[PDB]
């Protein structure tokens, strides 16, 4: 196999990053170091037109947690975007 996600990330232009950087911030509005733990993410949901629970939210974090830290970062989050590039399944 290969890395269709890790590759895209590196192959990102200021045009895209500039967008991702947006959420990253709102996804960590109130963080201590600069990560996510639902507490912050969920905050956006309510605005996104939804509101996931703290027990499930983890999914949005475990979906891109290749460190075992629990929180998402510019490394894990970014990928969280590539995985949801375009819907064509």
């Amino acid at each position: 196999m290969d890395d269709i996600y890790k590759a895209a990330v590196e192959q990102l232009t200021e045009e895209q990053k500039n967008e991702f950087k947006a959420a990253f911030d709102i996804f960590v509005l109130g963080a201590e170091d600069g990560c996510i733990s639902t507490k912050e993410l969920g905050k956006v949901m309510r605005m996104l037109g939804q509101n996931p629970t703290p027990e499930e939210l983890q999914e949005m974090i475990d979906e891109v947690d290749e460190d075992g830290s629990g929180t998402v970062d510019f490394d894990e989050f970014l990928v969280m975007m590539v995985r949801c590039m375009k819907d064509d399944s």
């Binding site: 500039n18 967008e19 959420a23 709102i26 956006v44 996104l48 949801c84």
Partner: peptide, 17 residues
Amino acid sequence: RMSADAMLKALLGSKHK
């Protein structure tokens, strides 16, 4: 949950697409 497309419209609907 939620597609980047949607998270890009709400969270950051401005300066997008």
